Amino acid sequence: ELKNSISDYTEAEFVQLLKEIEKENVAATDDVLDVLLEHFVKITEHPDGTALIYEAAARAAANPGGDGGGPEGIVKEIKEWRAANGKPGFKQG
């Protein structure tokens, strides 16, 4: 389900978004694709928010060692950034 901030997002709820982003990216939509893209980057505040989405797709397509190649690896990239930056990341639930 979509939250408003990164702080209501559990890892799995975030991956849920990430899967929807995956979905709308591979389907190539616009309304929701653009929501999700922005939504993701606004909550993560990652400078390369969408570059992460976009690389995750390519990383999935190529698939070297699984990690990062899929929705559950976008989150994984965010958790480290958020933590390193010292920003509140995902919640538990």
UniProtKB/Swiss-Prot annotation:
Alphabetical list of Gene3D superfamilies matching this protein: Colicin E immunity protein (1.10.1200.20)
Keyword Mitochondrion: no
Keyword Lyase: no
GO molecular function, one term: toxic substance binding
Spans traversing the lipid bilayer: none
Domain of life: Bacteria
Keywords of this entry: Bacteriocin immunity, Plasmid
GO biological process terms held by the UniProt record: bacteriocin immunity
Pfam families: Colicin_Pyocin
Function: This protein is able to protect a cell, which harbors the plasmid ColE7 encoding colicin E7, against colicin E7, it binds specifically to the DNase-type colicin and inhibits its bactericidal activity. Dimeric ImmE7 may possess a RNase activity that cleaves its own mRNA at a specific site and thus autoregulates translational expression of the downstream ceiE7 gene as well as degradation of the upstream ceaE7 mRNA.
The family this protein is said to belong to: Belongs to the colicins ColE2/ColE8/ColE9 and pyocins S1/S2 family.
Protein name per UniProt: Colicin-E7 immunity protein
